[PDB]
Design an enzyme around this catalytic site. Structure first.
Site, PDB file in Angstrom:
ATOM      1  N   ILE A  22      62.357  14.335 -32.556  1.00 57.44           N
ATOM      2  CA  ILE A  22      62.783  12.993 -32.926  1.00 57.44           C
ATOM      3  C   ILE A  22      61.627  12.253 -33.596  1.00 57.44           C
ATOM      4  CG2 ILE A  22      64.196  13.060 -30.833  1.00 57.44           C
ATOM      5  CD1 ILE A  22      61.947  10.141 -30.989  1.00 57.44           C
ATOM      6  N   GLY A  23      60.417  12.768 -33.402  1.00 55.28           N
ATOM      7  CA  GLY A  23      59.224  12.158 -33.954  1.00 55.28           C
ATOM      8  C   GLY A  23      58.021  12.379 -33.058  1.00 55.28           C
ATOM      9  N   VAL A  24      53.667  12.364 -31.238  1.00 56.94           N
ATOM     10  CA  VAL A  24      54.611  13.465 -31.400  1.00 56.94           C
ATOM     11  C   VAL A  24      55.554  13.564 -30.203  1.00 56.94           C
ATOM     12  CG1 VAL A  24      52.651  14.896 -30.747  1.00 56.94           C
ATOM     13  CG2 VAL A  24      54.837  15.979 -31.340  1.00 56.94           C
ATOM     14  N   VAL A  25      56.849  13.476 -30.482  1.00 57.00           N
ATOM     15  CA  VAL A  25      57.878  13.482 -29.450  1.00 57.00           C
ATOM     16  C   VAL A  25      59.018  14.408 -29.870  1.00 57.00           C
ATOM     17  CG1 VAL A  25      59.514  12.047 -28.143  1.00 57.00           C
ATOM     18  CG2 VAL A  25      57.327  11.078 -28.870  1.00 57.00           C
ATOM     19  N   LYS A  40      56.927  14.467 -24.735  1.00 60.03           N
ATOM     20  CA  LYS A  40      55.803  14.025 -25.545  1.00 60.03           C
ATOM     21  C   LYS A  40      54.603  14.934 -25.324  1.00 60.03           C
ATOM     22  CE  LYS A  40      52.638  10.185 -26.402  1.00 60.03           C
ATOM     23  NZ  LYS A  40      52.465   8.706 -26.429  1.00 60.03           N
ATOM     24  N   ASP A 134      50.497  -5.872 -24.602  1.00 63.21           N
ATOM     25  CA  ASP A 134      51.125  -5.909 -25.912  1.00 63.21           C
ATOM     26  C   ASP A 134      52.602  -5.677 -25.674  1.00 63.21           C
ATOM     27  OD1 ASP A 134      52.380  -4.850 -28.384  1.00 63.21           O
ATOM     28  OD2 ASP A 134      50.341  -4.799 -29.181  1.00 63.21           O
TER      29      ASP A 134
END
Length: 325
Positions: A22-23, A24-25, A40, A134
């Site tokens: 999906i995306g 580093v995942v 991940k 954040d």
């Protein structure tokens, strides 16, 4: 017991495969029926100072938190190497289809459910004496459903963008409290309500001024509670423009959300509402469920928070063992 490779090459452990990135995942499916989980991998993380100790904290931090609104670990696999070149680690997280960043731009029922999960997860966090520090819509994991999980954690340059950050964080008006994550919630709150970004500052020079219009100029005890000296001078030298006209600020909002906005966006961390106190707001009357707002039973221990060296590479192996005992 593990297999390769692409893309890019990483050894999963075969309890889960497919394995699409999906995306580093990557998203994977546990063979055991544990359905869809997010995996991940950490590239490097042993490559230097900082990025070593960062992932020791993140590892210990995900573990300490069990909450519906806070991301945690389903499993953590020994990235199998017998300490010979143990170069990486894989954390298994639950699969979230999207984040709040995707769908915010550009419903009063939809927000109250969202923010309620935001704040509940926020309270569990602060109970352990841990701050996200954040908070962006990119950090709020959302699928639909509409279940919410708080992404990433607390951790130069810049020119960079935080429009959700508290005026005490940057500008350092004075030192802060756990109420700073609420200013962020207030900023995200507006963006879903107003359909637009609240404080799009070119920088602190523009930001504070852009912030200035909505909350108005501070001449209560807010000034002189400021670290200042120039900031208090700047505050007083600036014309005391008269606040706070919230009802006029939001036409498309009910008095309730406007009222939660007002208490959430406030100059002084002392006066500003807390996560536990904001949960009590009548805005949650449909959703309010005190049972679903737990606190961390112990505090989060920072012990190792030099400090140190490949002992940290070795300290991470205490966990991955500790997880499996």
């Amino acid at each position: 017991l593990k297999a390769r490779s692409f893309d890019v090459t990483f050894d999963v452990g075969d309890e889960y495969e497919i394995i699409e990135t999906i995306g580093v995942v990557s998203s994977a499916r546990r063979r055991l029926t544990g359905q869809q989980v997010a995996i991940k991998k950490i590239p490097n993380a042993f490559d230097v100072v900082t990025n070593a100790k960062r992932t020791l904290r993140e590892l210990k931090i995900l573990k300490h938190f069990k909450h519906d609104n806070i991301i945690a670990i389903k499993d953590i696999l020994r990235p199998t190497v017998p300490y010979g070149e143990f170069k990486s680690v894989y954390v298994v997280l639950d699969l979230m289809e999207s984040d709040l960043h995707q769908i915010i731009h550009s419903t009063l029922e939809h927000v109250r459910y969202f923010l309620y999960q935001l704040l509940r997860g926020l309270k569990y966090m602060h109970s352990a004496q841990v701050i996200h520090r954040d908070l962006k819509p990119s950090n709020l994991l959302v699928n639909e459903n509409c279940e919410l999980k708080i992404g990433d954690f607390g951790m130069t340059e810049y020119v960079a963008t935080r429009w959700y950050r508290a005026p005490e964080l940057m500008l350092s008006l004075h030192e802060y409290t756990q109420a700073i994550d609420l200013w962020s919630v207030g900023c995200i709150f507006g963006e879903m309500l107003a359909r637009r970004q609240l404080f799009p500052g070119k920088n602190y020079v523009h930001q504070l001024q852009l912030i200035m219009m909505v909350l108005g100029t501070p001449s209560p005890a807010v000034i002189q509670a400021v670290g200042a000296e120039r900031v208090r001078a700047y505050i007083q030298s600036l014309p005391p423009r008269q606040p706070v006209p919230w009802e006029t600020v939001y036409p498309g909002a009910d008095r309730q959300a406007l009222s939660l906005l007002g208490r959430m966006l406030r100059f002084e961390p002392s006066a500003r509402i807390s996560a536990a106190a904001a949960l009590r707001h009548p805005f949650l009357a449909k959703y309010h469920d005190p049972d679903d707002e737990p606190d961390c039973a112990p505090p989060f221990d920072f012990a190792f928070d030099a400090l140190t060296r490949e002992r940290i590479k070795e300290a991470i192996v205490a966990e991955i063992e500790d997880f499996h005992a």
